[PDB]
Amino acid sequence: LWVDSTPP
Amino acid sequence: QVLVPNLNPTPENLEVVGDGFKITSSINLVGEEEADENAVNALREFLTANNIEINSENDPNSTTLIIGEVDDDIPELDEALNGTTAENLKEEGYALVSNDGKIAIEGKDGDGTFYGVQTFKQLVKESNIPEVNITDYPTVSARGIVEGFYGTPWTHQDRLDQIKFYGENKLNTYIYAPKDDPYHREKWREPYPESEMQRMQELINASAENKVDFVFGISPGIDIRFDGDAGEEDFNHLITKAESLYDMGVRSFAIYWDNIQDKSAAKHAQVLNRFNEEFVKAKGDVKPLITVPTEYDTGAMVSNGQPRAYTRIFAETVDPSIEVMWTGPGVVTNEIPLSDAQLISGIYDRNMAVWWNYPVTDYFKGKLALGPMHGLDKGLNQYVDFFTVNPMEHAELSKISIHTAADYSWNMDNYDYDKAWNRAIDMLYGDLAEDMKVFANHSTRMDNKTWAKSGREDAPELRAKMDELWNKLSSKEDASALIEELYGEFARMEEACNNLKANLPEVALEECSRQLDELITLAQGDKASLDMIVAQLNEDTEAYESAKEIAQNKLNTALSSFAVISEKVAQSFIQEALS
Ligand SMILES: *[C@@H]1O[C@H](CO)[C@@H](O)[C@H](O)[C@H]1NC(C)=O
């Protein structure tokens, strides 16, 4: 998780 | 007569008052013993770089330059401003006057005096200055960059160059918060090694030289413990870290909570308040604490007009002195309209900080974001007092976008995105600006097809012509003049991109060569697309089938290459022609 600010 | 050159940002009040003059070979410098040390050095470097000596004894035949702050008792300065004053201006403002062989700079404070020299530096072309009366000051009082993206952090030399650049454009804030720096986030408790600390010291020094407030960020959200002896130990860790940067001269701090699993709102704010009391206020020369909540875009903060649980509890607890950052209506988003500012500011009973996620491209790395600030309301200063952009992992080409940031946040109501965009490239690229515009023009819109959409649409005048062609063709009108107009645009993209490849300095070229290649490919496929249109008009099948293979070959190359550019324009044109 978290390589950009992709929503969850 | 001396024309006012391109200035950035746009000064609030400027008036031409004379024909201009040439600055003599050497000048009388006045007030430089009392004037801001950094403003004087900026002025000194510029004078050396342009072969202008400073006299030791006054020479009444020499241009005379007077500089100082309002709070300096220097009466030769007041006489030179000719009734113009910086006294009545807001912090960071200044007055500048050139008539009749004298140039006077009075900053409201030292920051103001430095920015006054920056303006002076932009006004002088080959020794010629215009004769003007300026008073100038920023709309937003915190302006700059949060280095906060995912991916390869900027290098030391990138940062040193960036900071010189901020100074020259009156940006006063740089937030050190790179996601991939282990000591910032994944391993936030650990001290920087001695050599990493020596690169920090250089960075802190260059910030102060350039009037940039260096903000030391830290993101402890991953695994910080909040309660009992563990909460103490982990809090003391924040303190030791912040203290070791304090001890090198840092006077701004940020504690960030974005993109983490733990959503303990009260705990988050409690850590902020504690740090604010035990560090920020206690030290007494430390600027207000900065933060970003785990919920930081309006979508994730608000539900049917009302704050979600995390936001509401966070806003309840967090000290009013702290700056709270938010990205707007989405993470990466077309606009912040006034009403979105109003809503968020309302939840927080404060002026907000924007963390604008453009030109960052960490979420869609094949494309360069090379457009102006866009979709940001021009009355935003009513609810925002702190504005920073999140740049690309590409420091050099980030400059185009940031350049327009300087203009938007300094002189907001006057901001014109297209004018500011042309200025950025004019100022940064020189001889190559025209061609750079041609290329850059195709690389302004960011769209990942899901959650991230922002920026001015790609080459819109060309999209408009592309659409008027399909209109003229389907309603069988003579399109033969548009077709020749379009062959020109496509040949031009190729001509320009080839010139950029041949003549761009390594620093730029190493950031955008794959996208230059991509646009030449697309320009060529567009040319063949038109060839396909023309052989359909001429009922010529031999020439249509072979312009169709060429078009297919170009599109195939662009779709599978890493580089991405002009998706909805130059690229879509070829997809359109193949149906
Ligand atoms: C999420 O958004 C951007 C884009 O991926 C990312 O660089 C940034 O670090 C994240 N956080 C915030 C507060 O925007």
XYZ file of C-alpha atoms and ligand atoms in Angstrom:
601
model
C 0.000 0.000 0.000
C 1.045 3.644 -0.875
C 3.041 4.445 -4.080
C 0.684 7.385 -4.799
C -2.384 8.781 -3.027
C -4.819 6.275 -4.532
C -7.986 6.366 -2.388
C -8.932 3.225 -0.372
C 12.790 54.452 -24.422
C 13.051 51.336 -22.234
C 10.135 48.909 -22.151
C 9.215 47.123 -18.954
C 10.477 43.535 -19.514
C 8.616 40.383 -18.475
C 8.243 40.436 -14.690
C 7.326 37.578 -12.381
C 5.333 37.806 -10.278
C 3.299 40.780 -11.596
C 3.919 43.696 -9.233
C 0.686 45.049 -7.717
C 1.177 48.740 -8.637
C 3.512 49.696 -11.482
C 3.684 52.971 -13.389
C 6.023 54.140 -16.133
C 7.236 57.592 -15.211
C 10.018 58.289 -17.726
C 11.825 57.188 -20.877
C 14.211 54.997 -18.870
C 17.992 55.245 -18.676
C 21.204 53.288 -18.988
C 22.786 52.450 -15.665
C 26.381 53.711 -15.688
C 29.450 51.396 -15.653
C 29.722 51.848 -11.950
C 27.252 53.084 -9.357
C 26.927 54.802 -5.993
C 25.606 52.381 -3.447
C 23.809 53.906 -0.464
C 22.418 52.378 2.724
C 24.003 48.960 2.228
C 25.468 48.913 5.782
C 21.956 49.008 7.342
C 19.928 47.275 4.612
C 19.113 43.576 4.754
C 22.343 41.512 4.453
C 20.691 39.062 1.976
C 19.156 41.781 -0.219
C 22.579 43.397 -0.456
C 24.277 40.101 -1.449
C 21.611 39.459 -4.115
C 22.242 42.969 -5.376
C 26.015 42.496 -5.168
C 25.977 39.208 -7.167
C 23.807 40.719 -9.884
C 26.066 43.759 -10.203
C 29.171 41.596 -10.478
C 27.481 39.259 -13.005
C 26.630 42.266 -15.165
C 30.012 44.066 -14.910
C 28.843 46.992 -12.781
C 31.471 48.287 -10.339
C 30.516 49.919 -7.037
C 32.265 53.234 -6.371
C 34.152 53.770 -3.070
C 33.834 57.564 -3.150
C 30.578 59.166 -4.354
C 30.586 60.021 -8.079
C 27.797 62.504 -8.986
C 27.965 61.278 -12.652
C 27.176 57.727 -11.638
C 23.797 56.096 -11.270
C 22.935 55.992 -7.576
C 21.234 53.031 -5.947
C 19.710 53.445 -2.471
C 18.402 50.498 -0.516
C 17.091 49.891 3.005
C 14.078 48.929 5.102
C 11.391 51.224 6.422
C 12.896 50.679 9.921
C 16.332 51.970 8.855
C 16.907 55.699 9.719
C 18.097 56.579 6.219
C 16.751 59.952 4.930
C 18.573 59.886 1.508
C 16.141 56.969 0.734
C 12.924 58.823 1.624
C 14.119 61.695 -0.642
C 14.571 59.234 -3.579
C 11.139 57.610 -3.351
C 9.547 60.954 -4.161
C 6.529 60.501 -1.854
C 6.228 56.737 -2.523
C 6.519 54.734 0.708
C 6.614 51.113 1.845
C 5.459 52.076 5.400
C 1.788 51.514 4.657
C 2.373 48.103 2.956
C 1.889 44.583 4.330
C 4.839 42.413 5.427
C 7.145 41.435 2.535
C 6.108 44.480 0.476
C 8.412 47.144 -0.903
C 8.471 50.308 -3.018
C 10.801 50.735 -5.962
C 11.410 53.943 -7.902
C 13.670 54.806 -10.828
C 13.762 58.361 -12.218
C 16.466 60.756 -13.168
C 19.467 58.443 -12.636
C 18.524 57.109 -9.195
C 17.030 53.739 -8.156
C 15.556 53.441 -4.656
C 14.385 50.297 -2.931
C 12.511 50.499 0.396
C 11.279 47.194 1.779
C 8.589 47.107 4.468
C 10.908 44.578 6.100
C 14.084 42.725 5.063
C 12.062 40.079 3.173
C 10.567 43.081 1.314
C 13.955 44.578 0.544
C 15.157 41.262 -0.926
C 12.048 40.989 -3.114
C 12.656 44.630 -4.171
C 16.088 43.605 -5.496
C 14.500 40.624 -7.243
C 12.240 43.048 -9.099
C 15.191 45.329 -9.802
C 17.086 42.326 -11.258
C 14.188 41.551 -13.671
C 13.824 45.204 -14.838
C 17.405 45.602 -15.993
C 18.195 44.572 -19.570
C 21.717 45.135 -20.866
C 22.201 47.984 -18.364
C 18.947 49.689 -19.368
C 16.245 50.112 -16.743
C 12.800 51.635 -17.206
C 11.836 54.648 -15.102
C 8.998 53.418 -12.824
C 7.156 53.832 -9.501
C 6.247 50.481 -7.890
C 4.602 49.456 -4.659
C 4.227 45.713 -4.414
C 3.249 43.042 -1.816
C 1.918 39.460 -1.856
C -1.723 38.434 -1.846
C -0.961 35.191 0.091
C 1.686 35.378 2.804
C 3.005 31.799 2.559
C 3.955 30.792 -0.987
C 5.963 27.880 -2.256
C 6.634 24.200 -2.629
C 6.044 21.046 -0.629
C 8.473 18.381 -1.909
C 6.054 15.644 -0.853
C 5.610 13.278 -3.782
C 6.329 9.530 -3.979
C 9.302 8.363 -6.009
C 12.920 9.501 -6.340
C 13.478 12.534 -4.039
C 15.125 15.649 -5.544
C 18.909 15.588 -5.314
C 20.942 18.038 -3.225
C 21.861 20.091 -6.311
C 18.205 19.997 -7.440
C 17.168 21.537 -4.117
C 19.924 24.181 -4.100
C 18.892 25.251 -7.624
C 15.214 25.184 -6.689
C 15.804 27.475 -3.690
C 17.707 30.094 -5.764
C 14.699 29.908 -8.089
C 12.145 30.431 -5.329
C 14.015 33.540 -4.132
C 14.103 35.042 -7.627
C 10.300 34.585 -7.910
C 9.354 35.695 -4.391
C 8.328 32.234 -3.182
C 9.108 32.071 0.547
C 8.283 28.486 1.525
C 9.875 25.093 0.926
C 8.602 22.055 2.748
C 10.988 19.165 2.988
C 8.687 16.115 3.075
C 9.713 13.557 0.400
C 7.686 10.359 0.802
C 10.527 8.084 -0.111
C 13.123 9.575 2.225
C 13.378 6.795 4.843
C 14.293 9.238 7.646
C 11.225 11.300 6.863
C 8.627 8.486 7.019
C 9.358 4.729 6.880
C 12.040 5.268 9.555
C 11.084 8.642 11.069
C 12.543 7.920 14.527
C 16.126 7.582 13.259
C 18.728 10.424 13.207
C 20.057 11.594 9.879
C 23.670 10.352 9.458
C 26.391 13.058 9.864
C 26.831 13.538 6.125
C 23.070 13.790 5.442
C 23.019 16.459 8.156
C 25.791 18.325 6.364
C 23.690 18.459 3.185
C 20.786 19.789 5.353
C 22.944 22.553 6.745
C 23.818 23.714 3.167
C 20.081 23.654 2.376
C 19.159 25.627 5.476
C 21.854 28.215 4.726
C 20.753 28.642 1.099
C 17.151 28.987 2.221
C 18.049 31.849 4.560
C 20.170 33.435 1.812
C 17.126 33.392 -0.475
C 14.411 34.359 2.048
C 12.828 30.910 1.841
C 11.351 29.520 5.072
C 12.682 25.964 5.086
C 10.023 23.736 6.637
C 11.222 20.433 8.074
C 8.445 17.875 7.590
C 8.031 14.554 9.303
C 5.399 11.809 8.710
C 5.275 9.565 11.841
C 1.793 8.166 11.016
C 2.977 4.704 9.889
C 3.622 3.383 13.421
C 3.827 6.184 16.034
C 2.536 4.948 19.418
C 0.236 7.459 21.239
C -0.290 6.275 24.874
C 1.683 5.425 28.050
C 5.466 5.044 28.112
C 5.524 4.207 24.361
C 3.677 7.421 23.513
C 6.219 9.358 25.579
C 9.159 7.647 23.944
C 7.706 8.263 20.456
C 6.880 11.849 21.289
C 10.454 12.438 22.547
C 11.495 11.133 19.132
C 9.683 13.893 17.298
C 11.318 16.353 19.677
C 14.863 15.050 19.210
C 14.511 15.095 15.456
C 12.922 18.567 15.226
C 15.500 19.775 17.762
C 18.439 18.535 15.716
C 17.118 20.547 12.731
C 16.347 23.461 14.983
C 19.999 23.334 16.058
C 21.100 23.908 12.438
C 18.799 26.907 11.993
C 15.395 25.501 10.904
C 12.502 27.599 12.156
C 9.439 25.981 10.494
C 8.132 22.465 11.069
C 5.434 20.182 9.646
C 3.948 16.942 11.029
C 2.022 14.992 8.435
C -0.644 12.333 8.716
C -1.646 11.623 5.091
C -1.859 8.106 3.549
C -1.744 6.068 6.750
C -3.945 3.349 8.177
C -4.377 4.719 11.719
C -7.251 7.172 11.920
C -7.030 8.237 15.583
C -8.130 11.909 15.068
C -7.914 13.007 18.677
C -4.481 11.319 19.078
C -3.202 12.973 15.868
C -4.330 16.460 16.991
C -3.148 15.797 20.567
C 0.371 15.124 19.235
C 0.197 18.373 17.241
C -0.980 20.415 20.249
C 1.669 18.927 22.517
C 4.457 19.661 20.011
C 3.058 23.172 19.481
C 3.280 23.863 23.254
C 6.512 22.070 24.107
C 8.473 23.055 21.003
C 6.955 25.682 18.764
C 5.808 28.153 21.394
C 8.582 27.348 23.881
C 11.305 28.179 21.330
C 9.541 31.459 20.539
C 11.276 32.151 17.197
C 9.504 29.224 15.491
C 6.768 29.787 12.889
C 3.304 28.214 13.205
C 3.229 24.369 13.052
C 2.028 22.857 9.785
C 0.002 19.700 9.327
C -2.038 17.565 6.922
C -4.822 15.340 8.381
C -5.390 11.728 7.336
C -8.518 13.125 5.628
C -7.304 15.977 3.417
C -9.486 16.363 0.334
C -13.076 17.558 0.555
C -14.359 14.221 -0.804
C -12.689 12.389 2.094
C -13.423 15.044 4.692
C -17.059 15.886 4.192
C -20.281 13.901 3.754
C -23.499 15.586 2.551
C -22.370 19.098 3.739
C -21.144 17.755 7.110
C -17.664 16.684 8.324
C -16.958 12.954 8.606
C -15.960 11.562 11.993
C -12.157 11.935 11.640
C -12.328 15.438 10.254
C -14.850 16.665 12.845
C -12.862 15.346 15.824
C -9.572 16.569 14.314
C -10.933 20.093 13.687
C -12.386 20.139 17.252
C -9.089 19.382 18.980
C -6.386 20.947 16.787
C -5.014 24.256 18.191
C -6.189 27.289 16.178
C -2.560 28.451 15.740
C -1.639 25.404 13.553
C -1.804 25.528 9.761
C -3.984 22.776 8.329
C -3.461 21.692 4.752
C -6.015 20.333 2.286
C -5.783 19.469 -1.415
C -9.204 20.837 -2.509
C -12.344 18.868 -3.680
C -10.261 15.810 -4.571
C -6.642 14.723 -4.187
C -5.822 15.782 -7.769
C -8.763 17.789 -9.003
C -9.883 20.273 -11.716
C -10.681 23.186 -9.381
C -10.873 24.752 -5.995
C -13.856 27.044 -6.326
C -14.380 29.687 -3.610
C -17.287 27.674 -2.177
C -14.985 24.651 -1.498
C -12.565 26.894 0.380
C -15.479 28.392 2.313
C -16.784 24.984 3.353
C -13.413 23.671 4.632
C -12.318 26.897 6.306
C -15.742 26.740 8.013
C -15.166 23.290 9.491
C -11.769 24.541 10.725
C -12.803 28.083 11.984
C -9.515 29.233 10.267
C -7.653 30.229 7.126
C -6.528 27.070 5.372
C -3.374 25.998 3.589
C -3.651 24.470 0.097
C -1.451 21.531 -0.797
C -1.997 21.790 -4.568
C -1.115 18.416 -6.234
C -0.027 19.777 -9.566
C 2.475 19.438 -11.255
C 3.216 16.269 -9.257
C 3.086 13.177 -11.556
C 3.885 10.273 -9.216
C 0.437 8.715 -9.902
C 0.892 8.813 -13.722
C 4.604 8.960 -14.434
C 4.709 8.856 -18.209
C 3.402 12.346 -18.648
C 4.906 15.728 -17.814
C 2.647 18.314 -16.121
C 3.854 21.484 -17.854
C 0.863 23.837 -17.630
C -0.029 26.868 -15.486
C -1.915 26.975 -12.178
C -5.488 26.330 -13.358
C -8.933 25.999 -11.791
C -7.898 27.865 -8.640
C -10.359 30.590 -7.681
C -8.985 34.133 -7.858
C -10.707 35.154 -4.644
C -9.234 32.153 -2.826
C -7.212 34.431 -0.530
C -10.430 35.021 1.478
C -10.115 31.549 3.074
C -6.485 30.590 2.254
C -3.327 32.236 3.653
C -0.766 29.535 2.832
C -0.321 28.115 -0.674
C 2.129 25.421 -1.823
C 2.339 23.128 -4.851
C 3.562 19.532 -4.964
C 6.052 19.378 -7.893
C 7.191 16.518 -10.172
C 10.098 14.267 -9.353
C 11.577 16.339 -12.311
C 12.917 19.490 -10.744
C 13.812 21.278 -13.913
C 10.534 21.053 -15.790
C 8.577 21.621 -12.572
C 9.894 25.173 -12.931
C 7.322 26.073 -15.630
C 4.330 25.295 -13.434
C 5.884 26.767 -10.233
C 6.712 29.954 -12.117
C 2.929 30.463 -12.559
C 2.435 29.529 -8.894
C 4.637 32.503 -7.995
C 2.322 34.739 -9.979
C -0.946 33.293 -8.742
C -0.108 33.528 -5.018
C 1.616 36.885 -5.153
C -0.876 38.793 -7.311
C -4.006 36.678 -7.259
C -6.865 38.820 -8.644
C -4.677 39.828 -11.583
C -3.667 36.207 -12.430
C -4.238 35.202 -16.080
C -3.230 31.520 -16.575
C -2.503 31.744 -20.308
C -0.478 34.985 -19.974
C 1.399 33.552 -16.968
C 2.046 30.349 -18.886
C 3.559 32.212 -21.841
C 5.600 34.299 -19.457
C 7.022 31.304 -17.601
C 8.301 29.754 -20.818
C 9.447 33.122 -22.208
C 11.475 33.767 -19.073
C 12.860 30.217 -18.627
C 13.633 29.152 -22.251
C 14.882 32.299 -24.021
C 15.739 31.594 -27.699
C 13.845 28.271 -27.455
C 10.629 29.541 -25.853
C 8.496 29.492 -29.003
C 9.312 25.828 -29.667
C 9.073 24.927 -26.025
C 5.548 26.367 -26.001
C 4.583 24.215 -28.994
C 5.676 21.050 -27.128
C 4.613 22.014 -23.566
C 1.202 23.050 -24.962
C 0.449 19.311 -25.499
C 1.438 18.339 -22.004
C -0.696 20.317 -19.563
C -3.642 18.004 -18.772
C -3.271 15.206 -16.214
C -5.830 12.427 -16.244
C -5.418 8.879 -14.907
C -9.017 7.949 -15.944
C -10.079 7.371 -12.293
C -9.298 9.496 -9.216
C -6.721 12.033 -10.543
C -7.761 14.736 -13.014
C -6.303 18.246 -13.090
C -4.837 20.969 -15.263
C -5.568 23.046 -18.329
C -6.781 20.974 -21.273
C -4.077 19.911 -23.774
C -3.587 22.148 -26.883
C -7.261 23.396 -26.996
C -7.129 25.541 -30.169
C -5.879 22.440 -32.029
C -8.588 20.213 -30.541
C -11.092 22.817 -31.740
C -9.759 22.637 -35.309
C -9.745 18.838 -35.114
C -13.438 18.905 -34.152
C -14.356 21.460 -36.902
C -12.776 19.043 -39.433
C -15.019 16.110 -38.443
C -17.947 18.557 -38.565
C -17.090 19.834 -42.038
C -16.488 16.261 -43.260
C -19.662 14.537 -42.001
C -21.820 17.420 -43.270
C -19.858 17.170 -46.597
C -18.466 20.766 -46.701
C -15.214 21.872 -48.444
C -12.613 21.217 -45.748
C -9.580 21.777 -48.029
C -8.468 24.991 -46.261
C -8.634 23.409 -42.769
C -6.664 20.397 -44.019
C -3.807 22.712 -45.185
C -4.044 24.661 -41.854
C -3.717 21.301 -39.989
C -0.816 19.937 -42.079
C 0.972 23.102 -40.874
C 0.260 22.555 -37.156
C 1.437 18.884 -37.381
C 4.593 19.737 -39.334
C 5.235 22.448 -36.756
C 5.051 20.043 -33.787
C 7.601 17.872 -35.501
C 9.829 20.915 -36.438
C 9.641 22.254 -32.876
C 10.241 18.980 -31.051
C 13.254 18.308 -33.302
C 14.634 21.733 -32.426
C 14.149 21.065 -28.724
C 15.997 17.718 -29.060
C 18.893 19.458 -30.772
C 19.180 22.511 -28.512
C 17.812 21.926 -25.019
C 20.479 21.859 -22.239
C 21.034 18.392 -20.633
C 19.200 19.537 -17.478
C 15.908 20.000 -19.352
C 16.465 17.400 -22.076
C 17.157 14.531 -19.616
C 13.700 15.215 -18.136
C 11.613 15.294 -21.367
C 13.331 13.515 -24.299
C 11.059 10.470 -24.273
C 8.022 12.802 -24.516
C 9.609 14.779 -27.353
C 10.031 11.450 -29.186
C 6.407 10.632 -28.354
C 5.068 13.907 -29.764
C 7.069 13.566 -33.010
C 5.600 10.084 -33.373
C 2.072 11.460 -32.862
C 2.614 14.487 -35.094
C 3.675 12.072 -37.834
C 0.676 9.849 -37.286
C -1.584 12.895 -37.459
C -0.024 13.860 -40.811
C -0.829 10.359 -42.108
C -4.291 10.624 -40.589
C -4.890 13.710 -42.731
C -3.434 11.803 -45.706
C -6.074 9.150 -44.972
C -8.803 11.826 -44.995
C -7.565 13.251 -48.313
C -7.373 9.839 -50.085
C -10.908 9.136 -48.897
C -12.026 12.405 -50.476
C -10.145 11.572 -53.711
C -11.627 7.978 -53.776
C -7.863 6.851 -54.024
C -7.545 3.423 -52.295
C -3.846 2.612 -52.936
C -2.889 5.812 -51.014
C -5.472 5.393 -48.251
C -4.350 1.856 -47.310
C -0.718 2.948 -47.093
C -1.435 6.106 -45.084
C -3.520 3.828 -42.860
C -0.591 1.486 -42.227
C 1.588 4.498 -41.386
C -1.038 5.925 -39.008
C -1.439 2.477 -37.344
C 2.338 2.157 -36.969
C 2.667 5.537 -35.213
C -0.272 4.910 -32.875
C 1.085 1.432 -32.071
C 4.421 3.044 -31.118
C 2.806 5.655 -28.891
C 0.412 3.305 -27.093
C 3.109 0.891 -25.978
C 5.883 3.450 -25.222
C 6.257 4.575 -21.575
C 6.008 8.312 -22.468
C 2.502 9.782 -22.556
C 1.480 13.034 -24.184
C -1.501 14.738 -25.832
C -3.817 11.749 -25.137
C -7.094 13.591 -25.927
C -5.637 15.653 -28.845
C -2.717 14.472 -31.063
C -3.283 10.810 -30.018
C -7.051 10.784 -30.101
C -6.878 12.331 -33.589
C -5.277 9.149 -34.935
C -7.790 6.928 -33.105
C -10.577 9.049 -34.570
C -9.284 8.688 -38.154
C -9.139 4.865 -37.773
C -12.929 3.983 -37.852
C -1.349 12.158 -2.193
O -1.372 12.854 -3.436
C -0.183 13.095 -4.179
C -0.329 12.546 -5.602
O 0.019 11.178 -5.664
C 1.054 12.591 -3.441
O 2.221 13.019 -4.109
C 0.991 13.128 -2.023
O 2.174 12.796 -1.349
C -0.189 12.527 -1.260
N -0.615 13.371 -0.142
C -1.308 14.523 -0.223
C -1.620 15.206 1.075
O -1.705 15.051 -1.267
